């Protein structure tokens, strides 16, 4: 069954709607052929249970050399490092080389080590929000939280966790996007900061995020160069703030639309964040996978080399398994989602994103209890192009 469309097609959206291709795909069946953006066929998985099988099947590999020749330098979302850096990029390998990187990265997201930074995370959020409110005091204009908070906050957090002291969040976001795009196929001020974080960790037993990465990497590789560690934390910084800042704009919009009870205990906050995660996934599809061998799944025989996507955004809003999927219901069955992926490549950073989301909400409820939208929720719009994360066009709010 085939639907001759680009699955990344996305017009301007309201808060409530999801693009129509998701329904078109799902009605066609569990495994649908589509027009890959960079040329040739591709296949979308539209059922949650079969998606979880695909993501756990060793025959669907990340290996980007298996991508069609035409895509190189063309496809928006082809992650292809130079072959010498692939062993150091979590998203480009599978099997033993991948478990090696997983063993190095997991202790960096230790829940106790992360929780020790809670106050610091709340301080960063508090400062950013206070200056935005004061700026509104001065100007008589609303604060724009997408440009002013959503990306700045997680970027400042991850940099501080890695020991990279950042002074200009906007400029650091620009600079790390250049390096990220080079690594996956003026930044010198940022490069010096990362190299310094790496020097400091090689020299001090202070158990920063960069130090645990270095200790484990040195153990797993015998020897690791500064360039290889800089390249790895560059990856964490991008992944650590782009998906998160896109999602935080949606979470902020739901909180300020008044949908959270003012008496909410920690369980209720958790259920609210989970429902935001089901309802507003930043990443609509999993990263490209390729059949390393001919595989027959969901009744469809897939050829060797078949590009395969799991539909995160569609399965998250599938009416066969969610009651009123396009309505925001914190107290629904807090239940299955693919917002963070599944299987061996499940998001290693999820713990940090959950801590940041709770902490942000706590700073808002405590110090900005009257914050609210400055436009109606029905006037909010979001979009995405190609392979980038979904994001709101703007989020004007009165913080006080
Ligand atoms: C709300 C925030 C986030 C969302 C929605 C999200 C989503 C995802 C998804 C969907 C994947 C798997 C993609 C695939 O297998 O096709 C993934 C993997 C990953 N994420 Fe997250 N992510 C978030 C936050 C973070 C943060 C804060 C970090 C680090 C600071 C991070 C680092 C990573 C890394 C390194 C991987 C690769 C894991 C692997 O391939 O083994 N993410 N994420
Ligand atoms: C020098 O870059 C790296 C070096 C080593 C490891 C890494 C990276 C890296 O850049 C990187 C990422 O950029 C991303 C991720 C990641 O794990 C890494 C590394 O591990 C995770 C991510 O794909 C998802 C889906 O959450 C988001 C993000 O991808 C970007 C590009 C994707 N194609 C997609 O557009 C996504 C939304 O943003």
């Amino acid at each position: 069954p085939r639907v001759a469309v680009d699955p990344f097609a996305c017009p301007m959206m309201t808060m409530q709607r999801k693009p129509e291709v998701h329904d078109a795909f799902r009605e066609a069946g569990p495994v649908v052929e589509v027009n890959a953006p960079a040329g040739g066929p591709a296949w979308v998985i539209t059922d949650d249970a079969l998606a979880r099988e695909v993501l756990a099947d060793p025959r669907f590999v990340k290996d980007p050399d298996l991508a069609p020749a035409a895509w190189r330098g063309v496809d928006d979302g082809l992650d292809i490092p130079v072959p010498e850096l692939r062993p150091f990029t979590l998203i480009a390998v599978d099997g033993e080389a991948h478990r090696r990187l997983r063993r190095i990265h997991a202790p960096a997201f230790n829940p106790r080590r992360l929780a020790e930074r809670t106050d610091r995370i709340a301080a960063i959020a508090g400062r950013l929000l206070t200056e935005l409110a004061d700026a509104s005091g001065r100007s008589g204009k609303p604060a724009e939280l997408i440009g002013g908070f959503a990306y700045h906050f997680p970027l400042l957090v991850i940099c501080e966790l890695l020991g990279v002291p950042v002074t200009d969040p906007a400029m650091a976001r620009e600079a790390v996007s250049v390096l990220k795009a080079l690594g996956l196929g003026d930044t010198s001020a940022l490069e010096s900061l990362l190299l310094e974080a790496v020097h400091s960790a090689r020299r001090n037993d202070t158990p920063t995020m960069t130090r645990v990465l270095y200790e484990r990497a040195q153990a797993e590789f015998g020897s690791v160069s500064d360039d290889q560690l800089v390249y790895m934390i560059t990856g964490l910084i991008f992944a650590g703030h782009d998906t998160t800042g896109s999602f935080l704009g949606f979470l902020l919009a739901e909180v300020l639309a008044g949908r959270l009870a003012a008496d909410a205990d920690e369980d209720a906050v958790s259920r609210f964040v989970e429902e935001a995660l089901r309802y507003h996934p930043p990443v609509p599809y999993t990263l490209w996978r390729f059949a390393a061998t001919e595989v027959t799944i969901g009744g469809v025989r897939l050829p060797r080399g078949a590009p395969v996507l799991v539909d995160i955004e569609g399965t998250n809003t599938d009416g066969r398994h969610h009651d009123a999927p396009h309505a925001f219901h914190p107290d629904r069955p807090s239940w299955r989602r693919l917002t963070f992926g599944d299987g061996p490549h499940y998001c290693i950073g999820e713990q940090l994103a959950q801590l940041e989301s709770r902490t942000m909400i706590g700073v808002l409820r405590s110090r900005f209890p009257e914050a609210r939208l400055a436009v109606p929720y029905d006037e909010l719009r979001w979009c995405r192009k190609g392979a980038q994360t979904a994001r709101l066009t703007e989020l004007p709010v009165w913080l006080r």
Side-chain angles (χ1 to χ4, degrees):
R2 171 169 188 260
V3 183
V5 299
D6 182 357
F8 295 96
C10 186
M12 198 67 57
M13 308 295 308
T14 60
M15 287 298 278
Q16 296 89 346
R17 293 196 172 98
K18 296 298 187 296
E20 295 186 347
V21 292
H22 295 296
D23 291 349
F25 294 163
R26 183 189 307 101
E27 292 156 11
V31 183
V32 187
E33 177 172 2
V34 301
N35 289 359
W43 289 259
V44 183
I45 312 283
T46 74
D47 167 79
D48 186 77
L50 188 64
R52 295 180 190 268
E53 287 181 24
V54 173
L55 295 170
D57 186 326
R59 300 174 307 198
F60 296 97
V61 303
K62 298 303 298 294
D63 189 358
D65 279 339
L66 264 49
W71 297 16
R72 238 194 65 239
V74 170
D75 185 57
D76 197 47
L78 187 55
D79 309 307
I80 184 171
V82 285
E84 59 268 28
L85 286 172
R86 293 186 206 176
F88 302 89
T89 131
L90 273 154
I91 58 175
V93 289
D94 291 277
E96 173 48 50
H98 183 251
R99 301 194 299 269
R100 181 159 56 219
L101 294 177
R102 297 290 289 196
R103 282 192 303 271
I104 291 162
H105 280 79
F109 293 88
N110 173 304
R112 187 178 46 240
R113 293 200 270 265
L114 255 21
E116 278 161 21
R117 310 265 46 71
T118 295
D119 287 347
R120 188 55 198 154
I121 292 162
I124 298 173
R127 172 163 175 176
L128 283 169
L129 286 169
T130 300
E131 313 204 65
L132 286 171
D134 287 352
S136 282
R138 287 194 316 269
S139 77
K141 292 306 155 154
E144 204 291 277
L145 293 201
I146 304 308
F149 183 87
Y151 299 98
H152 287 9
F153 163 57
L155 178 61
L156 285 174
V157 176
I158 190 56
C159 287
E160 164 136 7
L161 289 179
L162 293 162
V164 182
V166 149
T167 196
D168 196 298
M171 274 180 205
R173 161 151 172 241
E174 274 182 85
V176 69
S177 302
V178 189
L179 305 177
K180 166 250 161 193
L182 302 173
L184 301 183
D186 171 64
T187 54
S188 64
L190 179 54
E191 289 175 73
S192 285
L193 291 194
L194 308 149
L195 195 45
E196 284 160 23
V198 164
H199 289 159
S200 163
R202 199 184 286 272
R203 151 171 277 271
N204 294 116
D205 73 319
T206 319
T208 74
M209 184 174 294
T210 300
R211 172 67 182 196
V212 317
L213 294 167
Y214 156 67
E215 293 181 342
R216 310 295 220 117
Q218 180 175 72
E220 298 272 357
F221 287 100
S223 170
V224 59
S225 67
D226 290 342
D227 287 347
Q228 285 158 348
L229 288 163
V230 166
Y231 170 88
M232 286 189 281
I233 60 163
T234 298
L236 285 183
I237 292 173
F238 195 92
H241 97 285
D242 187 81
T243 48
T244 309
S246 297
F247 165 73
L248 287 184
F250 286 109
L251 179 58
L252 282 161
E254 297 291 346
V255 171
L256 309 177
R259 310 198 153 164
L260 182 71
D263 75 76
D265 61 13
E266 282 159 25
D267 285 335
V269 176
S270 176
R271 288 191 301 276
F272 188 97
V273 169
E274 283 293 330
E275 177 69 349
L277 285 165
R278 177 202 72 77
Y279 192 54
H280 299 295
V283 182
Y285 300 92
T286 50
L287 301 172
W288 284 121
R289 275 139 175 96
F290 303 100
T293 199
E294 172 184 288
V295 170
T296 302
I297 201 61
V300 197
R301 192 162 84 211
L302 292 180
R304 152 150 197 191
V308 179
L309 304 166
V310 163
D311 192 343
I312 291 169
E313 189 173 63
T315 55
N316 272 12
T317 58
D318 183 7
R320 300 173 315 203
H321 304 107
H322 294 103
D323 165 70
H326 307 298
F328 183 89
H329 289 158
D331 316 292
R332 79 172 49 242
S334 198
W335 197 229
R336 310 186 148 107
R337 76 289 204 279
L338 287 170
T339 304
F340 293 101
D342 198 28
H345 291 264
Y346 185 87
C347 179
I348 191 69
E350 181 190 1
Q351 258 312 111
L352 185 51
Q354 297 270 16
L355 180 57
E356 295 179 352
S357 301
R358 286 183 263 122
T359 305
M360 177 189 85
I361 291 175
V363 170
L364 277 171
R365 290 171 78 193
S366 169
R367 302 191 57 248
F368 304 91
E370 274 161 62
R372 69 213 167 252
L373 300 183
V375 299
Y377 174 94
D378 277 49
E379 289 182 34
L380 295 176
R381 301 281 186 274
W382 60 276
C383 209
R384 44 175 173 74
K385 137 178 191 181
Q388 50 190 272
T389 55
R391 66 191 82 185
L392 284 155
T393 56
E394 58 168 34
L395 185 65
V397 313
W398 306 108
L399 286 161
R400 279 153 176 168

